[PDB]
Amino acid sequence: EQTYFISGANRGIGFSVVQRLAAKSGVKVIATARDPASATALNELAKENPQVKVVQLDISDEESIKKIAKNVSQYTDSIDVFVSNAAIAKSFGPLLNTPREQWIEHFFTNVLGPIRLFQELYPLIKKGTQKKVFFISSNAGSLNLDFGLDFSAFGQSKAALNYSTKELARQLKPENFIVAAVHPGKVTKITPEESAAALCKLFESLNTTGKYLSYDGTELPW
Amino acid sequence: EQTYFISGANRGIGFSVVQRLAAKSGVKVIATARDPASATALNELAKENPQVKVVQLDISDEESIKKIAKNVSQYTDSIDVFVSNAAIAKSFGPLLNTPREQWIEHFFTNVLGPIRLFQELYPLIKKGTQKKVFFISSNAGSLNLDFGLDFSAFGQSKAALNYSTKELARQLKPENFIVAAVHPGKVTTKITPEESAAALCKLFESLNTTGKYLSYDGTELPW
Ligand SMILES: NC(=O)C1=CN([C@@H]2O[C@H](COP(=O)(O)OP(=O)(O)OC[C@H]3O[C@@H](n4cnc5c(N)ncnc54)[C@H](OP(=O)(O)O)[C@@H]3O)[C@@H](O)[C@H]2O)C=CC1
Numbered sequence: 001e002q003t004y005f006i007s008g009a010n011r012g013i014g015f016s017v018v019q020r021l022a023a024k025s026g027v028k029v030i031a032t033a034r035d036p037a038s039a040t041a042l043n044e045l046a047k048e049n050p051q052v053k054v055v056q057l058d059i060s061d062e063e064s065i066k067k068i069a070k071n072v073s074q075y076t077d078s079i080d081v082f083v084s085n086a087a088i089a090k091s092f093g094p095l096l097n098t099p100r101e102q103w104i105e106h107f108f109t110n111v112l113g114p115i116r117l118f119q120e121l122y123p124l125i126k127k128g129t130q131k132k133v134f135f136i137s138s139n140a141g142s143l144n145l146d147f148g149l150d151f152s153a154f155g156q157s158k159a160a161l162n163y164s165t166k167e168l169a170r171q172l173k174p175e176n177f178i179v180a181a182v183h184p185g186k187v188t189k190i191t192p193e194e195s196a197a198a199l200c201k202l203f204e205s206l207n208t209t210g211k212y213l214s215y216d217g218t219e220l221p222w
Numbered sequence: 223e224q225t226y227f228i229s230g231a232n233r234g235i236g237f238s239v240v241q242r243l244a245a246k247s248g249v250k251v252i253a254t255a256r257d258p259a260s261a262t263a264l265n266e267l268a269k270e271n272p273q274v275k276v277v278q279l280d281i282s283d284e285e286s287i288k289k290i291a292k293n294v295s296q297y298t299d300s301i302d303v304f305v306s307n308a309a310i311a312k313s314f315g316p317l318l319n320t321p322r323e324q325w326i327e328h329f330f331t332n333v334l335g336p337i338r339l340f341q342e343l344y345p346l347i348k349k350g351t352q353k354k355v356f357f358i359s360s361n362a363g364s365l366n367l368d369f370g371l372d373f374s375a376f377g378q379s380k381a382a383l384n385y386s387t388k389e390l391a392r393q394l395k396p397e398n399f400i401v402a403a404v405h406p407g408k409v410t411t412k413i414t415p416e417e418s419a420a421a422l423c424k425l426f427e428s429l430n431t432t433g434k435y436l437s438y439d440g441t442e443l444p445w
Pocket residue numbers: 007008009010011012013014033034035057058059060061084085086087088089109136137138139140183184185186187
């Protein structure tokens with residue numbers, strides 16, 4: 001029935017999302033890892049559960065992104081639900097203390113990567129039924145939330161991706177796409193499995209485009 | 223006396239702000255161009271108003287930015303009013319149709335450029351009296367306005383820099399800095415460069431509180 005694509009599936013929320021989706025009948029899961037050979041838990045899941053297909057992706061690497069569509073296509077003729085989950089969070093604290101390379105790495109990995117990944121997998125998503133597009137954002141990316149914390153290149157990258165996500169939702173509303181930015185929670189802290197359970201109910205239930213959502217389905221201000 | 227710094231002063235609003243500042247007594251202007259020797263208007267401006275100093279800045283070029291503090295330090299001990307004006311606006315419309323290079327170029331020129339520029343000229347701004355920091359933003363950069371247009375890399379770059387401008391306002395409030403993101407208007411409702419400059423100069427002088435996102439007319443925009 002349905003194909004999910006989850007970037008960054010070897011650990012954290014991505015692994016827990018793939019584990020949760022692997023439990024549902026009639027769900028095929030394209031799961032990505034930078035280094036699949038070292039994705040122990042994900043490889044063992046895929047060994048027990050043939051519905052889970054493991055593909056290499058480095059979203060920091062144009063040469064990897066240029067291959068994701070042809071490689072995914074070996075395993076599926078369509079994607080129902082796209083989840084750009086793979087990301088970095090390596091730069092917090094004041095602007096004056098954040099060197100050039102942190103800004104660059106968060107832009108390439110957290111902004112350009114997800115945009116190029118979507119661009120490449122759009123034809124596969126257009127061919128699917130559900131046409132859902134989820135960007136795993138952060139409440140730190142809001143322009144209208146104050147946490148009393150600096151988020152530096154990490155927060156900027158989530159705001160940047162948020163801006164483009166909102167635009168994308170407008171652009172693909174006439175093609176009946178559902179596009180969302182989703183804050184997965186602080187992983188008060190929640191566990192990745194709890195986040196994944198809530199994220200997967202959201203992925204299945206969300207029926208409107210253009211939303212910025214917390215994992216529980218409540219709205220966040222852009 | 224006060225020292226103003228303006229990136230991208232060879233044409234557009236940049237030129238019009240420098241021209242207006244040059245008219246105000248006791249103002250010295252550090253004015254930037256990528257190619258100061260081709261900046262015929264600004265060079266003539268500076269010839270007639272030598273309080274205007276023309277320095278080389280390409281905000282897309284880290285090697286250029288690594289030299290700005292030294293180039294500016296030639297002419298001043300301090301900056302009272304910093305203005306990141308220099309920027310590009312090359313990519314609009316759909317994401318699927320926005321190639322890699324357009325995303326990269328707006329990030330490097332419109333986001334990284336200004337943060338690097340501010341990091342480099344912060345010691346000079348710190349020594350100054352007014353501690354005013356202005357990023358020429360766009361209303362298109364708002365996460366909370368709908369123009370019935372898509373702004374692609376351009377709009378993303380203005381929203382990215384807005385996020386950091388807000389953080390920078392918070393971060394520098396202790397040091398009594400005034401940090402603002404300012405939409406200068408859609409200059410040639412379009413308004414003239416000279417109209418846009420007059421509004422901005424008034425804003426640059428009047429603004430007394432940090433963390434604001436302002437249109438040229440002094441009303442606030444939602445982040
Ligand atoms: N959990 C939280 O508290 C919050 C997290 N988020 C969002 O949650 C999402 C998931 O976070 P979480 O699982 O905790 O993060 P982790 O850092 O634990 O995991 C990140 C995942 O992304 C992968 N990844 C990183 N860089 C790349 C790359 N260049 N190419 C491909 N894959 C890559 C990692 O693979 P590898 O093992 O190779 O490094 C890993 O699978 C992120 O997208 C983030 O934006 C937002 C804010 C709050």
